[PDB]
Amino acid sequence: EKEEAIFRSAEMALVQFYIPQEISRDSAYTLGQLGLVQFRDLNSKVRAFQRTFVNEIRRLDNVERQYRYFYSLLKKHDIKLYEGDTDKYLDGSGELYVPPSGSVIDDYVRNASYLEERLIQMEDATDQIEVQKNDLEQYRFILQSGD
């Protein structure tokens, strides 16, 4: 079937939910893949700091912070990025195939950390040789006038 809805107007049916929570997040792909829908949230009279997901997003946001931090240094020196190869194929048309993923994000958090250590140590422990070396050769040159 198909209704023009441009010589008319449409209507989307609401649905009552009593989904048990036991499929809470593993079922995320359910609507993440081809949800193609809108919601009427019921969470009212209570705010971010008062609700639950605020807590984890507080740990999350840090990863984006450090990522955009990296981006500057990455573009800094001489090199480009291949761009998201997934973006060409992973977001391929409209698919039910979106590969599953559960907790791996936390593994990503720890790994991006371990990295951020690498990055901080590198940047802050390489950014000094310059000046002390420079003054050292400066004095060396000064030595030449000792005759």
- Does 39 sit near other proteins (CB under 8 A)? yes
Question: How many Å apart are CA 101 and CA 82, to the nearest integer?
Answer: 24
| Least separation in angstroms between CB 72 and other proteins | 12
From residue 61 to residue 90, what is the string marking binding to other proteins with x (rule CB under 8 A)?
A: --xx--x--x---x--x-x-xxxxxxx--x
Give the shortest CB-69-to-other proteins separation in angstroms. Answer: 11
Q: How far apart are CA 81 and CA 86, in angstroms?
A: 13
Q: Which of 45, 49, 107, 120 contacts other proteins by CB under 8 A?
A: 107
Size of the site for other proteins (CB under 8 A): 97
Using CB under 8 A as the binding rule, whether residue 109 contacts other proteins is answered as yes
Who's near 84: CB < 8 A, 6+ residues apart? 90
* Residue 23 interacts with other proteins (CB under 8 A): yes or no: yes
Residue type, position 3, single letter: E
